[PDB]
Every structure is written in structure tokens, then in C-alpha cells.
Design a binder for this molecule. Structure first.
Ligand SMILES: Nc1nc2c(ncn2[C@@H]2O[C@H](COP(=O)(O)OP(=O)(O)NP(=O)(O)O)[C@@H](O)[C@H]2O)c(=O)[nH]1
Ligand SMILES: [Ca+2]
Ligand SMILES: [Mg+2]
Ligand SMILES: [Mg+2]
Ligand SMILES: [Mg+2]
Length: 166
């Protein structure tokens, strides 16, 4: 079976861990425990083939973000996550895109832009603004909620499959 190495990046608190845990373990993490670097692995059938997903859940807090670059190196595709109620996290997305380009030494890396926390009503990033950013990068934009599960499989499966196009 084919192995896909996925990496989830973005600012502190945007819901990287909650997204990954919802996908892999089918529950919502309500509390906020900042991540250093965690890994998850699971076999799943995507569009008709058994896939081993290896998912690296990275730190968004700068204090916990030491050595993030080395662990990301083997990443084949990246989820770049912001929260729709956190304008700064959206403005921060370029930092992550630049880091990915530097770790992979490439301008053509499989990626998906994810607007998380779409269940929340205090939206400050409109869908259209994020679509425009994604278009500039040549990548999909998908909204998610780790709380309700909306879009969660779609985000990770879009990623696994952008990889199949490269
Ligand atoms: N309402 C709502 N809350 C969410 C969602 N995703 C995450 N949260 C909440 O936001 C907080 C931070 O989530 P977490 O997944 O830890 O964020 P992170 O991006 O992994 N943080 P770090 O970079 O420090 O590891 C938690 O309280 C979590 O419940 C979501 O889709 N909706
Ligand atoms: Ca819970
Ligand atoms: Mg985390
Ligand atoms: Mg490099
Ligand atoms: Mg505005």
C-alpha cells in the first residue's frame, strides 16, 4: 500500500491538533494543550486504494516550534491552517508557505489552504478572501470544523490527492 506523509502547519491555536485528532480518532478535543511535535498513522481507503497516512502535527507556538523544520523535511504534502475568527492567523499563512518552500527546496509542493473553526460565528476572514489567496498559490481552499467534523475528511483527502497530481 502507498504511504502518504502529511504535515499540518499554521499559527498557534488554529486547530491543527483538533483537526488531526478528529480525522484519526473521531472525537473533538475541547481543551487547548499546545503541541511540540506529534505523529499519527492510520490505514484508510481513499478513492479505492489502501493508503497509509502518516500525519505530523506541528507546533504553532513559537516557544514550542524548535526543530519544526527538520521534522517537516520528509513531508510530501502540507495542510496550511488558519482560523476564520483569527485574522492574524490568515495574515501569517505566508510565513508557513515560505518555510515549506525552504524545507522542500521547491516552488511546487502539494498543499491545501484550510479555514478552520467554520462552526464559529465571529468570522473575520470571509471565504472569498481565502479563495483569492489559495488561487494565487495554485491550491485548493477548504473550510473545516474540527468540532462538527464538517470538511475534515475533505481537507485531508484533497491533500492526499493534490499529491497524486504532482
Ligand atoms: N469551535 C471550535 N473550536 C476549535 C476548532 N478547532 C479547534 N478548536 C479549539 O481551539 C483550541 C486550540 O485547538 P488546537 O487543536 O489545540 O490548536 P493547535 O493549532 O493544535 N495549537 P498549537 O499550535 O499550540 O499546537 C482548542 O480549545 C480547541 O477545542 C473548531 O473547528 N471549532
Ligand atoms: Ca471532547
Ligand atoms: Mg496542536
Ligand atoms: Mg532548503
Ligand atoms: Mg474584512
Amino acid at each position: 500500500m502507498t504511504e502518504y506523509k502529511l504535515v499540518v502547519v499554521g499559527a498557534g491555536g488554529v486547530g491543527k491538533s483538533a483537526l488531526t485528532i478528529q480525522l484519526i480518532q473521531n472525537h473533538f478535543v475541547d481543551e487547548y494543550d499546545p503541541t511540540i511535535e506529534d505523529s499519527y498513522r492510520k490505514q484508510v481507503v481513499i478513492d479505492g486504494e489502501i493508503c497509509l497516512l502518516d500525519i505530523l502535527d506541528t507546533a504553532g507556538q513559537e516557544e514550542y516550534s524548535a526543530m519544526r523544520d527538520q521534522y517537516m523535511r520528509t513531508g510530501e504534502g502540507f495542510l496550511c491552517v488558519f482560523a476564520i475568527n483569527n485574522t492574524k492567523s490568515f495574515e501569517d499563512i505566508h510565513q508557513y508557505r515560505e518555510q515549506i518552500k525552504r524545507v522542500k527546496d521547491s516552488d511546487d509542493v502539494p498543499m491545501v489552504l484550510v479555514g478552520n473553526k467554520c462552526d464559529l460565528a465571529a468570522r473575520t476572514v470571509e471565504s472569498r478572501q481565502a479563495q483569492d489567496l489559495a488561487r494565487s498559490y495554485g491550491i485548493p481552499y477548504i473550510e473545516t470544523s474540527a468540532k462538527t467534523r464538517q470538511g475534515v475528511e475533505d481537507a485531508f483527502y484533497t491533500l492526499v490527492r493534490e499529491i497524486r497530481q504532482h
